[PDB]
Amino acid sequence: PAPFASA
Amino acid sequence: AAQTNAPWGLARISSTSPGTSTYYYDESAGQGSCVYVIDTGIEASHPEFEGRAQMVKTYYYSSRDGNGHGTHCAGTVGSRTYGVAKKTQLFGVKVLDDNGSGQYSTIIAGMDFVASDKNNRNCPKGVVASLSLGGGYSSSVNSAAARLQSSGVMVAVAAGNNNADARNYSPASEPSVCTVGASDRYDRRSSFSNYGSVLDIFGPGTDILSTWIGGSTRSISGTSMATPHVAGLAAYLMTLGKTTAASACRYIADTANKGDLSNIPFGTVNLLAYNNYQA
Ligand SMILES: [Ca+2]
Ligand SMILES: [Ca+2]
Structure with missing residues (x-):
């Protein structure tokens, strides 16, 4: 799930 | 138009070559287009957005970007200094929480939301x-x-x-x-x-x-x-x-730009986004 880094 | 001392990536997008620092683009700058940033939200009050950003949907307690990731991405799309399309309209859809995570069910709903919501926008x-x-x-x-x-x-x-x-x-x-x-x-x-x-x-x-x-x-x-x-x-x-x-x-x-990148494994395109803007 989710994205690539609350970056 | 020319933006001096632009972020390297903007300069890269308007160049045949690496190693330059000016971004060149047609002054139309994406005016009249819209970009949805489906992410942790967008801090629409940021001066860099010039009133061209707004939140349109959240699945969480708030529409605020409490992370930064979505704001950063939105900035690369359309901020005045850091953006590719400096006059586009930005719409934030907060499918990711402030830890940068979201359930696939939420992410799916956000995509279907954009498919409909564009019919509410100019x-x-x-x-x-x-x-x-x-x-x-x-x-x-x-x-x-x-x-x-x-x-x-x-x-x-x-x-x-x-x-x-x-x-x-x-x-x-x-x-x-x-x-x-x-x-x-x-x-x-x-x-x-x-x-x-x-x-x-x-x-x-x-x-x-x-x-x-x-x-x-x-x-x-x-x-x-x-x-x-x-x-x-x-x-x-x-x-x-x-x-x-x-x-x-x-x-x-x-x-x-074709063939410019290194360490591209065979079978992957060697293609780098380029605006082909010629003043
Ligand atoms: Ca070159
Ligand atoms: Ca494809």
Whole structure:
């Protein structure tokens, strides 16, 4: 799930 | 138009060559287009957005970007200093929480939301969606991305940051969208960038300066940073009338800088997003 880094 | 001392990635998008620092672009700048940033939100009050950003949907207690990631991505699409398409309209859809995470069910709902919501917005030059997110392969997530694209939105998605084949990640692996890998300022494939047959294009993704929450800025890295370069480029090209939402990914690949990148594995495109702007 989710994205690539609350970056 | 020329923006001196631009972030390297903006300069790269308007150059045949690495190593320059001015971004050149047609002054139309994506005016009349719209880009949805489906992410942790957008700090619309940031001076860099000049009132051109707004939140339109959240699935959480607040529409505020409490993370920064979505604000950074939005800045690369469309901020005055850090953006590719400096006059586009930005719409935030908060599918990711402030830890940068979201359930696939929420992410799917957000994509279907954009497919409908564009009919509530004024985007005479067309509509783009930027998805700097993903997880493991999901046919349902891919199908949502496919619907969004089919509905008349140029969908750009991150390839992922696994240094692996993007076939195993979603929405990266959906063939019909524009799957974006990352490069660095020396035209290397970014160390973390996914690759594979499903990639359509690369954009700048290592050490990308953009907006952050609290009215700030910072440099971060990821295929999340490459994706909004491509989304903004699409909006810009659509405003110019050079392409359409259905055809923009192909057009960007057609007109890309070819063969410039290093460490591209055989079977992955060696194509770097390029605006082909000639003053
Ligand atoms: Ca050169
Ligand atoms: Ca594709």
